[PDB]
A paper describes a structure:
The inhibitors of HIV-1 protease (PR), an essential enzyme that cleaves gag and gag-pol polyproteins into mature functional proteins, are the key element of effective cART1,2. Blocking the activity of PR leaves virions in an immature state, which are unable to infect cells, thus leading to restoration of the immune system. In the present studies, we designed and synthesized seven novel PIs that incorporate the unique 6-5-5 ring-fused crown-like tetrahydropyranofuran (Crn-THF) as a P2-ligand as in GRL-142, GRL-121, GRL-001, and GRL-003.
While early-stage amino acid substitutions (after 20 weeks of passage) occur mostly in distal region of PR, late-stage amino acid substitutions (after 30 and 51 weeks of passage) start to appear around the binding pocket. In order to understand the molecular mechanism of drug resistance, we compared the structure of PRWT with mutant variants PRDRVRP30 and PRDRVRP51; each protein was crystalized in complex with an inhibitor, GRL-001 or GRL-003. In the PRDRVRP51 structures, however, we observed significant structural differences around the 30 s loop (residues 29–35). Actually, there are only three additional mutations present in the sequence of PRDRVRP51: L33F, I54M and A82I, strongly suggesting that the substitution L33F is a major trigger for these rearrangements around the 30 s loop. Consequently, the salt bridge between the residues of Arg-57 and Glu-35 in the PRWT structures was lost in PRDRVRP51, and a new hydrogen bond between Glu-35 and Arg-20 was formed. Concomitantly, the 30 s loop lost its contacts with the flap region, which appears to become even more flexible, leading to a widened ligand binding pocket. This could be one of the main reasons for the reduced binding affinity of DRV towards PRDRVRP51, resulting in the emergence of DRV-resistance. Additional factor that contributes to the enlargement of the flap region is the substitution of the Ile-54 (in PRWT) with Met-54 (in PRDRVRP51). The large side chain of Met-54 slightly pushes the flap loop away from the 80 s loop (residues 79–84), causing a shift toward Pro-81.
Numbering used by the authors:
A (entry chain A), B (entry chain A): 1 to 99
The structure:
């Protein structure tokens, strides 16, 4: 779809067998969710944002469905105030900005 | 223009008579710059992001040029790790997401 920006660009996600909502976030390099339970090994990572840093778990090669489009890639799990779909996944679904 | 997401979507800005670069950030409600000097009255604001909160100065009705497009609106000034153009300005330049 085309999505305008009058409201937060929130879409429906399936990840790890669970359903969530997440913000299409062109300012995010990576994809971050709070309150998901992913399988297998992970690696602790510190990431920076406004406000400072956040410890996350880094999971690699995770399948995700983003508004009906399939992608796989790294998902970070940690205390973000809103789930975000970052460019690592957006590039796989052909998402672009236009003005 | 159309902008893909293989790299950070950074554009050239003029704000307060000064030239800067900033990220087109659909995950940002508001527009934030570090290291700009805006004229006139402002109001202290705490904003949240990953990592926690950040104190900013809130300036209203600030003209900005974003990749050659004119907008006016609220600009927040404070210690962000990267300057961001948020939806308050993106809607005025007709920016949309597409996939
Ligand atoms: C640069 C920064 C913009 C990136 N963030 C993405 C922005 O879109 C976030 C999304 C957001 C919204 C709300 C919220 F509670 C928390 C986050 N917006 C945000 O803080 O907005 C703030 C601010 C703007 O006005 C209002 O709107 C929401 C809120 C309020 C004040 S990030 O979440 O820090 C992030 C994401 C992925 C990522 N991947 C990395 N990988 C490492 C480098 C290789 S580092 C990294 C850092």
């Amino acid at each position: 779809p085309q999505i305008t920006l009058w409201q937060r660009p929130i879409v429906t996600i399936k990840v790890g067998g669970q359903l969530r909502e997440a913000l299409i976030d062109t300012g995010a390099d990576d994809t971050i969710f709070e309150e998901i339970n992913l399988p297998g090994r992970w690696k602790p990572k510190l990431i920076g944002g406004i406000g400072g840093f956040m410890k996350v778990r880094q999971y690699d090669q995770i399948p995700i469905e983003i508004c009906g489009h399939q992608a796989i890639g790294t998902v970070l799990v940690g205390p973000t105030p809103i789930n975000v779909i970052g460019r690592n996944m957006l590039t796989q679904i052909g998402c672009t900005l236009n003005f």
